[PDB]
Design a protein around this nucleic acid. Sequence first.
RNA 1: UCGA
Lengths: 195, 111, 1111
Amino acid sequence: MKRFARKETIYLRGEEARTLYRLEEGLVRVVELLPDGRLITLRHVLPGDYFGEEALEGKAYRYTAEAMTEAVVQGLEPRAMDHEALHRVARNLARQMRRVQAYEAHLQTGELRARIARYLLFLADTPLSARDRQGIYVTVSHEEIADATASIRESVSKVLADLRREGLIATAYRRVYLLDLAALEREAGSALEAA
Amino acid sequence: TGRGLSFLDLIQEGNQGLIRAVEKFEYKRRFKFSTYATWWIRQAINRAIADQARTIRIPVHMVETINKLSRTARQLQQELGREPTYEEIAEAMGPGWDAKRVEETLKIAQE
Amino acid sequence: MEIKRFGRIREVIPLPPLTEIQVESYRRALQADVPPEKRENVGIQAAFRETFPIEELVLDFLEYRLGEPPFPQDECREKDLTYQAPLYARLQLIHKDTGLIKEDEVFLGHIPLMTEDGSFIINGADRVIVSQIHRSPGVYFTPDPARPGRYIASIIPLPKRGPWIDLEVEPNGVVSMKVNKRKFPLVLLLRVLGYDQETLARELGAYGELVQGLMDESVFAMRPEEALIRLFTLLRPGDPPKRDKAVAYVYGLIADPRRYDLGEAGRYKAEEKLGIRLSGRTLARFEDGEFKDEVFLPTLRYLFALTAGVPGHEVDDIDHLGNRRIRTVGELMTDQFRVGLARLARGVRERMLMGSEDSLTPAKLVNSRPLEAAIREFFSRSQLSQFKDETNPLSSLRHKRRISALGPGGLTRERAGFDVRDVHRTHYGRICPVETPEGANIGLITSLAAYARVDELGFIRTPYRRVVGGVVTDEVVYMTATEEDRYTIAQANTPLEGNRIAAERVVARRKGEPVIVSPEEVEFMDVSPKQVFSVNTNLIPFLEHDDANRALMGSNMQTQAVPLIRAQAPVVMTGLEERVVRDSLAALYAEEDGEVAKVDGNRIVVRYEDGRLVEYPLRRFYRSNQGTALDQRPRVVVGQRVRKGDLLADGPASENGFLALGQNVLVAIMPFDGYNFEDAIVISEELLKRDFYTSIHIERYEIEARDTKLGPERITRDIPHLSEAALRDLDEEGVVRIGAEVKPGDILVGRTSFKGESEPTPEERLLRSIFGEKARDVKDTSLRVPPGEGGIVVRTVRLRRGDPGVELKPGVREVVRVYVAQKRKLQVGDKLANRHGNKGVVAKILPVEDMPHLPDGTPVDVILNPLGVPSRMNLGQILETHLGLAGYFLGQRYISPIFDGAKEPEIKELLAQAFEVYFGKRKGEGFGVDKREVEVLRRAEKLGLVTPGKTPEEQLKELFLQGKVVLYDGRTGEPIEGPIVVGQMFIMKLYHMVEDKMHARSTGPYSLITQQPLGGKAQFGGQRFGEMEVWALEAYGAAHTLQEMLTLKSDDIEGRNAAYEAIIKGEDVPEPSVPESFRVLVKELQALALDVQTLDEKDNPVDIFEGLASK
RNA sequence: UCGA
């Protein structure tokens, strides 16, 4: 068992994939870093999901896993799994395949506004979300939203500013409040698989 | 003697106490000088022992606390016919004392 | 198998209880099983009687009692506790003025108890209190080295119990007395005693007018009071001569039984020497207001009578065992108890002044801290209190019977010359002349004889059989050396028919002097040869054929023998191997007759005649002090009928109740390819195959997790920056799992400690930023396996804070212990030895095909070089080899007693009987003599070994009777060109093993002040390059090597850093700098106000402190 | 106290 802080990495690309991991608590992102420095969110790892999948087939990790929240993960030895464990791994990997393909579809569906609304609504169903008086909210930066909506920070900030002017959302301190679920739902069109 | 200070040292500090007594002595009270002197000499010796006996210097009141813990443990071991536990010492010390404080006190008092 | 015992000597008595020297001493000291009212005045009782009553209110001693131990022995060993019993004393405080009597039973602390085997348990560890030999108290007369015709009288009390008084006759003619480095005329002290000129004249007049010189008018003129004041002014200058002060001082110096105590042996020796009777243990008395002499006058009289040359007066031999006594456990313990009691008494006296003079109990008056401190000091920190040697039962058995001349109240190493280390004639039957340490400790450490016992006076006695007329009785008398010197004592091997002496001339002793004597002159006779030697020496067969110097090594090395899993008794025994095991207490025996109900690995249940069902648990794989495994195995089966004293379970290093210190191997005596060079040993891999010389060893590891000001240390499985591979064998709590195999580098117990605060270097900042990973708060302080060790984890013990029954030292949260055991096979570098002093290291292990072999295909086990025998002169191993051969083929074992054993003819006979089996079998199998056997026989008759003309069979028999056989070289197949000695030998595997001693270091821990590498393998230290090594390097003219030793490899910090970096970078090492110990030297010389300045050729200052040490 |  091991705990990770926000922005801390669990493993790096090109490093030995000796350990398979399962997320117990929090939210993890699987990403790829380009030479030009652009960061792209490839997929979301939720509690119960297995990641570091490279340990099951290769010798080294191909992608970088970064904790988005305080996270609790469990280390596992691939060669030491029984029938039941392999069953859980297979089923969960299938689930993550479905979700990553749905995410694929999401990235190419609708304009930036719709993609942003959809991503916000998706995050609303993750450990990245919480709630207080102002309403439901998600702890996420504009940079991360850009990384997960196939765009760059600036444009995302612009669209979010538009939504603030329209009263759909509110933002402060890397924290975004979803004030009108119905309107965001209409903007997104189709919802993104949360499980 | 035997409390960590040499005989001569105790003698000298005692002499200092004697000086204090000489400066403070009022002959009108008709009490003999030795009576008044003895208290000041005893005080000077005790203060000296409390001050100089340890390589790692410990505050006088804290030294008193340590000594009280010592005598307490001695009494308890004398009645129980064996070495006392931390809880028993804490009980015998009365209000404010638990096992943690006794242990910490013993640790602090380590030479 | 059959057991054939030799020897015609019949011992009327068996060996005494071997641990009785400890057991009886401590039993006498404690008097625990004696009811308080019936206790004699000895030991603890004597201490109390001496310390009390405390006068100043008066505190008096009534009686004491000892309770039962709060915890058993095993529990004490487990929890690191001292095995002890609570001591209480009933005391009554009396006010002589009022008549007031307040009585209470006060707790004085605990007193350590002796175990069944005669040892102690101190803080969880087993310890032994070694008896200490010294000069017996009394009155001695020695020749004055300066003046030949004169003598010195020495008055000796017990150690720490008084000063030594010396009576001397000065050249001026006056008799001087020496006390506390001061000398004065004895006449003065005599006058203080109340002597008058008349009495001294009539008493001392006879002795050649010696008295006239002593007489002094001025002294006799003044009365004893003025003489007392005068004496006080002489002994204590500057001290005002108050009369009561003089009385007190002189009394305290001479007549005070509290400050001056002659021994009981002192009193007895004084009475015997001077022919008088002492009213007490003091030199004088204070009675009816005055002083009364006791000792002084008879000693002066004896001195004069000796000086005058009066017959019947002798000088005393100070190395004579009549004048030298043993202080056993009881005496020492009682002594320290007496000291602590005296301190307690001081505390009481101080408490009887302060506070309220009216309301006082004995509980308020008595502080037992000084007593407990004194006793704990004795058991823990004394030199006579030693870490128990329990490699094997014989080790501890010998340890308990050892006698040291060192320790407190005794000789230092420089003090001991030739006189003390020598073997005295009186050592016969008392102190073993053989068993003593080689080297600096020679003669200082010795061993108690087998039949010897220490009497109540502290003198070693030895038994003798009475001989009246020519008839030898069966009654035995234990005599001291002094009483022994009176009679004429015949040897034990003197021929006897029945109880009658059968020799016309016998060998006897008179005062140690050997003499030929008629049977009518025979007053006594030795009980047995065994009484002359120690327990270890008596286990050496054919001792008479072994030179003493090697027998010494044999004796000492038997102690070092490691318990083997397949251990066997020797084929040639002395018959003492059963008794050693029995007295050792390691092995288990049946109390009474009965039937065995249950037999298990863990326990044996026995149903006796009484019907009572007794269950004996067995010790399994326990770790001894030296890390050897002590374990008991059941030798009986369920439903077996056993008698009283019958073996139930075998202890460690024992076979069927017999002492098994090693294994019986087939040995050949011959050189082999220089692998036997200089005492080296070659062994067969077959030994490893069948698990011979395999031993179990357990090591103890410990780690503490304590509270720190930086936060609590925690023992956990969660260890920073570690892979799952590293944490594999650790449980949930972080402790290694039982049964797991651990190797060097592996984690035993996981632990994290809060990192000390610091500022990260800019490099660390940049790194942290690059990887985007926060630096963890805790650091990995886990206990790991040291280099060269490791094995299987057999046990785990964890003790926390706040759990029932356990409490640690202050600040310590929890302690975890992990016990790791390992199976050690015999390997290259391990040390082997026999009982005859032959020792060597295993240099080569050959495959079976390379081993020399008998014609019938049987390969030998061990190959010993014959070059080791002639110079060492230990021939016992040869005879053991022959008899071992005979026993090997006849399938039997033998008992050859000390000095009366199997002789050559009988061994030849056995060799013939063996040859019948070795050859007759072959001839019956339809096989004749071999060609190579014929060639070897040819070369043999060329050597004059066999008689020419006899048949090959007869010649082979002739060779076999010489203990030699035909041997084939396994490599070539061709035989050895000559007959070679082959037979069964008993060989032990010693405690010195390469695995423990192999060590190496690149870089590591350095010392605080010197900044030089540490010492010892345990600290991962470097080797010490000493003065002589430096001399060697200088003589080689190797300046850069020497400079490396003095700088880069030691205390040159910049130098060693730069050197390491250079080596790992592939660069050549840089020029070295100033050694730090020189800077330390300079500053330490500055502390002594000496200015040390390093100068250049221009005599200008050079700064070796590099900008650091000056403002 | 060992070992050489």
